[PDB]
Design a protein around this ligand. Structure first.
Ligand SMILES: O=C(O)c1c(C[C@@H]2C(=O)Nc3ccccc32)ccc2c1OCO2
Ligand SMILES: O=C(O)c1c(C[C@@H]2C(=O)Nc3ccccc32)ccc2c1OCO2
Lengths: 148, 148
């Protein structure tokens, strides 16, 4: 549905890349953090929910699901926190392929940026703009349709 | 029109709040930084352009307009950099009112967050969700219409 997002955490260069995927479109937002904490995850979700109409988040692991700080952010922002258990198993493989794909793009841009965070944002750009309609186009269409 | 954004820089608690406003909708994204530099502005624009289809940015001052780093980011992301000179003078006053309004909201949430950055993201949330349709709804509709 239009409001469903999935959290995803992947590792690169001794750092963590936290990713939110809009499940119906494939659109992503991402940030680099030193390590996955409840505090970082809570702040990331607050940013996300101020930018898109986030109704439901499938959390990436049990620690973030349990985190009182993540729960506080979800309460504040009106997000239903759910487990991310892939009862449909093609869900997990799609996330796995996306992490591989994002890492490939990061490799392709890596030498154009001094800092990993910049390379990650370049990769977000390329991912969201790539036509296959683009993910950026798909999310806007899905949400506009839901509004009207 | 769907692709036009305006940069805006305002001060609070000895820090800087960098804001991008989607002119046709009133939708905003914002971040807290220690001070306005070309490097921070460049990174902010890269993030913005990976998330929304940014065609044109009216820069907030001559230093960011001149900055080689900001120019590099605009080139990379396919953004036309323009001056933000308000040849229509009601433009400035609208930005002024928005800064006042954002600061009011920040004051209303300030005690719910330990860190200013959190209060700012709460304020972004409230601003974008407030029905006036909300700014969040307006930007999605404008861009979806442009896609079709
Ligand atoms: O105290 C903070 O500023 C803070 C919080 C808690 C804050 C709150 O009290 N309630 C609430 C609700 C939603 C998001 C963040 C919060 C979470 C994560 C953070 C924070 O600073 C940066 O990363
Ligand atoms: O070198 C960086 O990582 C970097 C850049 C330059 C980088 C580039 O070389 N080209 C380019 C194009 C678009 C955005 C950033 C850049 C700008 C701003 C930053 C940076 O790190 C964090 O804040």
């Amino acid at each position: 549905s239009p409001g469903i997002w999935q959290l995803d955490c992947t590792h690169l260069e001794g750092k963590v890349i936290l990713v939110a995927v809009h499940v119906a479109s494939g659109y992503i937002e991402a940030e680099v953090i030193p390590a996955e904490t409840g505090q970082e995850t809570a702040y990331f979700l607050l940013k996300l929910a101020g930018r898109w109409p986030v109704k439901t988040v499938h959390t990436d692991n049990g620690s973030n699901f349990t985190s009182t700080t993540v729960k506080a952010a979800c309460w504040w922002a009106g997000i239903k926190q759910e487990d991310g258990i892939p009862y449909n198993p093609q869900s997990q493989g799609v996330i796995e392929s996306m992490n591989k794909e994002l890492k490939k793009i990061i490799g392709q841009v890596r030498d154009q940026a001094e800092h990993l965070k910049t390379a990650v944002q370049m990769a977000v750009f390329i991912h969201n703009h790539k036509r296959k309609y683009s993910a950026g186009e798909r999310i806007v269409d899905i949400i506009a349709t839901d509004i009207q």
